[PDB]
Amino acid sequence: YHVDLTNCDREPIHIPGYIQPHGCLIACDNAMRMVLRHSENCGELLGLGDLNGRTAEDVLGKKLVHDLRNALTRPAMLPAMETSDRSFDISLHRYKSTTIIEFEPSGSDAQPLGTARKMVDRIREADSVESLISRTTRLVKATLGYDRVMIFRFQEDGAGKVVSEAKQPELESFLGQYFPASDIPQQARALYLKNTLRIISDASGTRIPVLPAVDVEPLDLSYAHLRSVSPIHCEYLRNMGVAASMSISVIVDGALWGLIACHHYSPRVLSMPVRIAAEMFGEFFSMHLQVLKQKRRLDTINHAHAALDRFLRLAAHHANIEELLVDSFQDFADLMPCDGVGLWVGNNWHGHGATPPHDAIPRLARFVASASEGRVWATHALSQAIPEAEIYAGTAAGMLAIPLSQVKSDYLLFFRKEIVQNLNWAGNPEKSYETGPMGDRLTPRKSFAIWKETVRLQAQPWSEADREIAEAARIALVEVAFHHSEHH
Amino acid sequence: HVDLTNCDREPIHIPGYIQPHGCLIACDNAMRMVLRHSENCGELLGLEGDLNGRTAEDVLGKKLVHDLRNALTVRPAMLPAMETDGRSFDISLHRYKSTTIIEFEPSGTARKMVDRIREADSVESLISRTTRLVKATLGYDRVMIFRFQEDGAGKVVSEAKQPELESFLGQYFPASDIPQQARALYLKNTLRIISDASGTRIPVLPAVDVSGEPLDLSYAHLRSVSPIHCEYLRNMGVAASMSISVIVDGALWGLIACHHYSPRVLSMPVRIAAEMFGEFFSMHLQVLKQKRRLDTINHAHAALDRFLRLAAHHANIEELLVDSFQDFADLMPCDGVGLWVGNNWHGHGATPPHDAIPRLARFVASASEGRVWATHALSQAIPEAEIYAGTAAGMLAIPLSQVKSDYLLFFRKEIVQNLNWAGNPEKSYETGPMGDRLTPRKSFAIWKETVRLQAQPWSEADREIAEAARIALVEVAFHHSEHH
Ligand SMILES: *C/C=C1/C(=C/C2=NC(=C\c3[nH]c(/C=C4/NC(=O)C(C=C)=C4C)c(C)c3CCC(=O)O)/C(CCC(=O)O)=C2C)NC(=O)[C@H]1C
Ligand SMILES: *C/C=C1/C(=C/C2=NC(=C\c3[nH]c(/C=C4/NC(=O)C(C=C)=C4C)c(C)c3CCC(=O)O)/C(CCC(=O)O)=C2C)NC(=O)[C@H]1C
Ligand SMILES: [Cl-]
Ligand SMILES: [Cl-]
Numbered sequence: 001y002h003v004d005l006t007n008c009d010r011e012p013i014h015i016p017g018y019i020q021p022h023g024c025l026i027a028c029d030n031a032m033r034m035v036l037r038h039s040e041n042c043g044e045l046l047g048l049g050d051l052n053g054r055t056a057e058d059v060l061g062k063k064l065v066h067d068l069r070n071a072l073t074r075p076a077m078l079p080a081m082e083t084s085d086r087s088f089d090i091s092l093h094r095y096k097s098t099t100i101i102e103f104e105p106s107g108s109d110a111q112p113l114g115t116a117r118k119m120v121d122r123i124r125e126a127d128s129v130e131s132l133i134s135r136t137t138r139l140v141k142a143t144l145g146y147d148r149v150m151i152f153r154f155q156e157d158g159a160g161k162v163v164s165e166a167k168q169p170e171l172e173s174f175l176g177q178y179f180p181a182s183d184i185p186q187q188a189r190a191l192y193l194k195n196t197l198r199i200i201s202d203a204s205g206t207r208i209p210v211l212p213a214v215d216v217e218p219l220d221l222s223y224a225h226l227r228s229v230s231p232i233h234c235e236y237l238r239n240m241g242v243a244a245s246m247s248i249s250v251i252v253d254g255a256l257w258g259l260i261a262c263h264h265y266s267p268r269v270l271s272m273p274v275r276i277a278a279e280m281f282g283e284f285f286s287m288h289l290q291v292l293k294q295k296r297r298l299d300t301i302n303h304a305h306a307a308l309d310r311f312l313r314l315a316a317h318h319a320n321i322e323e324l325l326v327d328s329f330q331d332f333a334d335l336m337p338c339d340g341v342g343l344w345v346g347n348n349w350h351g352h353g354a355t356p357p358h359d360a361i362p363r364l365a366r367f368v369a370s371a372s373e374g375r376v377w378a379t380h381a382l383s384q385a386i387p388e389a390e391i392y393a394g395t396a397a398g399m400l401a402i403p404l405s406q407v408k409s410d411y412l413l414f415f416r417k418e419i420v421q422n423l424n425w426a427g428n429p430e431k432s433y434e435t436g437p438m439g440d441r442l443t444p445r446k447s448f449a450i451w452k453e454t455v456r457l458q459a460q461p462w463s464e465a466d467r468e469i470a471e472a473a474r475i476a477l478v479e480v481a482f483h484h485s486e487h488h
Numbered sequence: 489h490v491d492l493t494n495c496d497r498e499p500i501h502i503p504g505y506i507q508p509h510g511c512l513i514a515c516d517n518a519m520r521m522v523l524r525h526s527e528n529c530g531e532l533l534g535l536e537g538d539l540n541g542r543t544a545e546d547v548l549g550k551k552l553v554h555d556l557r558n559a560l561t562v563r564p565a566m567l568p569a570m571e572t573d574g575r576s577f578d579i580s581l582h583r584y585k586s587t588t589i590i591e592f593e594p595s596g597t598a599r600k601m602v603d604r605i606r607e608a609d610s611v612e613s614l615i616s617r618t619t620r621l622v623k624a625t626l627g628y629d630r631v632m633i634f635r636f637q638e639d640g641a642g643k644v645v646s647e648a649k650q651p652e653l654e655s656f657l658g659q660y661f662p663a664s665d666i667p668q669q670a671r672a673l674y675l676k677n678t679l680r681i682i683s684d685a686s687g688t689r690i691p692v693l694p695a696v697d698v699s700g701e702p703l704d705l706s707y708a709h710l711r712s713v714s715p716i717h718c719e720y721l722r723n724m725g726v727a728a729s730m731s732i733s734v735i736v737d738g739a740l741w742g743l744i745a746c747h748h749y750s751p752r753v754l755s756m757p758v759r760i761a762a763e764m765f766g767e768f769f770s771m772h773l774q775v776l777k778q779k780r781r782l783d784t785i786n787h788a789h790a791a792l793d794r795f796l797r798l799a800a801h802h803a804n805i806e807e808l809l810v811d812s813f814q815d816f817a818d819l820m821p822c823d824g825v826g827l828w829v830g831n832n833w834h835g836h837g838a839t840p841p842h843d844a845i846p847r848l849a850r851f852v853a854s855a856s857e858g859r860v861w862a863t864h865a866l867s868q869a870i871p872e873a874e875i876y877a878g879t880a881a882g883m884l885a886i887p888l889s890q891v892k893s894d895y896l897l898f899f900r901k902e903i904v905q906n907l908n909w910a911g912n913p914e915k916s917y918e919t920g921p922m923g924d925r926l927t928p929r930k931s932f933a934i935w936k937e938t939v940r941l942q943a944q945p946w947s948e949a950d951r952e953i954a955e956a957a958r959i960a961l962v963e964v965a966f967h968h969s970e971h972h
């Protein structure tokens with residue numbers, strides 16, 4: 001009946017009963033024969049009496065309904081459609097056996113293909129994920145004219161990290177900030193996956209009711225670009241000073257990688273033709289990112305194999321493998337991202353970088369021995385496995401253990417610091433936010449504080465690539481040990 | 489003069505002629521002056537006299553030269569339905585070797601073709617349907633795909649044809665049937681057009697300029713065809729062709745080859761659609777090929793992990809391998825596998841005889857540095873291997889020890905033994921002056937001779953799977969000693 005902080009995790013944001021006022025909406029039966037529903041502003045916007053029950057040809061003219069019926073062969077995006085009286089940008093789709101027609105007054109626009117080609121040409125030569133992600137916020141802001149453009153990337157736990165930002169010089173920075181998974185509820189994530197673009201013209205605009213809200217059953221606006229916005233998010237945006245937004249969904253391995261989020265501090269909406277271009281840019285961006293990400297993964301795997309092969313050849317001419325490992329173990333830190341590495345062999349410890357103290361190591365080795373079946377064991381939350389590890393979480397909150405034997409509890413141990421310790425936040429800790437009725441929950445400062453609490457005593461998770469490199473290292477050492485036993 | 493003795497280095501990029509389905513003007517780098525023109529420019533464009541030493545503005549007019557200069561500030565630019573006298577020409581424009589080349593032909597599809605391949609979810613399904621679709625859409629008598637082999641031979645892997653034509657499906661041609669300069673131009677250009685294999689070539693005037701420079705037609709679509717290739721097509725009864733280059737990992741994977749038994753050239757708009765289809769085909773093939781490779785590697789890892797878990801509760805690893813070795817044949821394509829341990833042989837499928845294994849095991853022990861050793865030409869390494877080439881022409885050897893010459897051996901048959909050729913051995917061909925050489929029958933016979941006593945090469949993927957198997961066995965052996 002009324003959304004608040006206790007139920008916003010389940011708000012039915014796909015059936016709000018309202019649209020935003022920058023266009024009007026007509027809902028027809030699946031044949032587009034009769035008008036079933038309309039937004040209240042259809043009269044004003046299109047120049048029409050009482051719309052429900054009239055035929056589509058009566059309301060819109062036979063010529064337009066004919067062209068629209070043809071188009072029904074993603075919603076169809078049809079700029080500069082000639083109405084019976086003027087030009088309208090029309091979005092047309094069928095869902096839940098309902099035809100939804102969305103109208104915006106047409107302006108003067110370039111062909112979307114040409115706008116998109118200009119943008120795509122300025123990222124297509126990026127040859128690292130870093131270079132693509134940093135340039136894209138600057139390019140999008142320059143092309144679309146928003147006050148702020150950010151990219152955020154979803155973390156393994158569903159949190160967002162802001163990884164790129166272009167902004168007006170007077171704004172606060174969010175670069176290197178995180179927000180908790182709960183800042184974007186599951187239904188919003190489902191709709192970001194389904195729709196390339198999400199448009200908010202005015203976070204404080206009066207909603208326009210869909211007549212009727214409930215029929216003789218609510219209207220499913222999942223694919224309607226005019227669909228109204230959650231009061232919770234509108235309040236969040238108002239607290240930030242944001243009045244408008246457009247997000248471009250980033251799809252990698254068929255899932256929602258993150259968003260290109262465009263924010264404006266005054267009501268703002270892009271023409272349909274520029275939105276078509278943005279959608280084409282989004283598709284290209286996603287594919288180029290996926291290709292760069294794959295090449296980065298391949299290069300990091302090949303780097304590890306090259307290093308471990310050098311180690312195999314080195315060890316072949318060494319009578320004392322323990323001594324070689326005591327002299328060499330620091331070099332293994334270069335296989336994967338870590339803040340420390342150590343060697344635990346025959347109840348003797350050797351450490352490099354950020355590691356637990358020497359006295360803490362026996363408890364860690366005993367735990368891994370009990371917990372693993374002679375393969376790699378890794379956690380990003382040590383205190384959860386070993387309460388005692390809380391004391392040294394600042395230095396080492398995460399551990400990946402590579403067994404050196406199936407008959408002795410000897411390990412190569414990799415460590416990561418508590419994630420808050422490696423923050424590179426460009427933001428202003430003295431920047432404060434106004435609130436509304438829901439209070440300070442709906443502010444970036446509180447979002448960030450909630451995130452910090454969700455990852456307290458935790459490190460950056462060990463990725464599938466980190467685990468693949470650990471397995472390669474485990475195997476290379478089995479091989480060093482076996483050939484050593486063969487030849488001695 | 490080209491013949492079979494020098495066609496391997498024919499300078500086909502500077503032939504001094506064009507095909508008759510358009511005309512060509514060569515200007516300086518700034519498109520100021522006409523330097524060369526095809527002899528048919530007068531007839532096609534309604535121009536009189538020697539065009540050389542006339543300004544581009546004179547010959548083309550102020551509007552066209554302005555438009556072409558603008559197109560130049562941007563692959564060759566394709567400008568369909570340009571206004572000349574108010575006539576319409578499809579214009580191709582490019583710059584190469586400080587020369588502007590302008591090509592003229594008297595004057596939707598891509599989305600429809602791409603939509604019919606985009607849902608293919610195997611390389612087999614994509615390449616099977618593509619010949620059918622291209623034939624139906626572009627209206628050629630035959631459409632084939634061939635894929636280049638590691639030695640540069642072509643294998644015909646897909647075919648759509650008129651029911652009255654002979655089949656080339658499963659046929660190979662040797663690397664020499666496509667010379668190195670032809671391969672370079674197939675890599676550089678998405679499309680290669682032959683409007684008429686019996687068309688009279690049109691000279692470029694002059695062929696060699698006052699400075700002694702030929703005109704480099706590397707990027708010109710009207711570039712004329714080697715007399716060697718025209719004779720080959722005339723022997724087949726082919727009169728016209730268009731190829732779409734297939735690019736995988738930035739290299740020439742093969743061609744989509746469209747053949748017509750009468751003259752044929754597609755309009756520039758349809759060619760632009762075919763090029764867009766070719767780019768999509770290449771990217772979709774690359775994606776499907778990667779997926780197949782990943783699935784094959786993961787399949788091998790899953791099997792080897794099952795072998796590792798199985799081995800952990802076995803006291804006698806030699807016995808488990810004697811009982812299990814035949815399953816290792818499922819890791820990579822092979823016709824046979826066997827286990828050579830403590831000088832005892834266990835074989836499955838097509839292998840050399842019992843008597844032959846010591847010599848092979850001896851050779852690998854001497855040849856390898858304790859890692860995987862593989863050849864597809866056993867007789868080259870070991871002359872007496874010729875005797876059993878029919879059964880086993882290729883061998884991949886996985887060491888089971890660095891102190892004992894114990895091996896897991898994989899074998900492949902002589903490649904001619906695994907042939908699946910759909911052609912007619914009684915179909916014969918007319919020949920011209922160069923003779924028998926320029927016929928599909930002779931090309932196939934030459935290929936067979938180049939691969940005699942050889943198997944299918946062990947791929948980079950086969951070798952990665954062999955390395956995984958070598959390592960899994962090291963792990964079995966080590967954990968066994970750890971607990972025994
Ligand atoms: C219980 C429900 C809540 C909720 C719902 C919604 N959030 C939606 C969008 C959204 N929210 C944010 C969060 C931010 N946290 C920050 O710290 C921060 C900036 C510093 C932001 C912007 C983000 C990032 C987004 C994504 C859109 C964008 O990036 O612009 C949302 C959907 C809105 C829509 O219909 O378009 C809903 C619903 N937000 C909460 O905080 C809670 C409590
Ligand atoms: C010494 C030079 C030779 C030579 C030159 C050229 N070949 C070119 C193209 C070409 N040749 C073939 C060969 C085939 N072998 C078959 O068995 C067979 C059919 C069953 C064919 C068609 C192929 C496949 C091609 C590629 C084009 C296509 O697939 O249609 C060539 C380039 C021509 C150009 O400029 O377009 C040159 C030059 N061919 C020889 O046989 C030798 C001796
Ligand atoms: Cl507005
Ligand atoms: Cl990434």
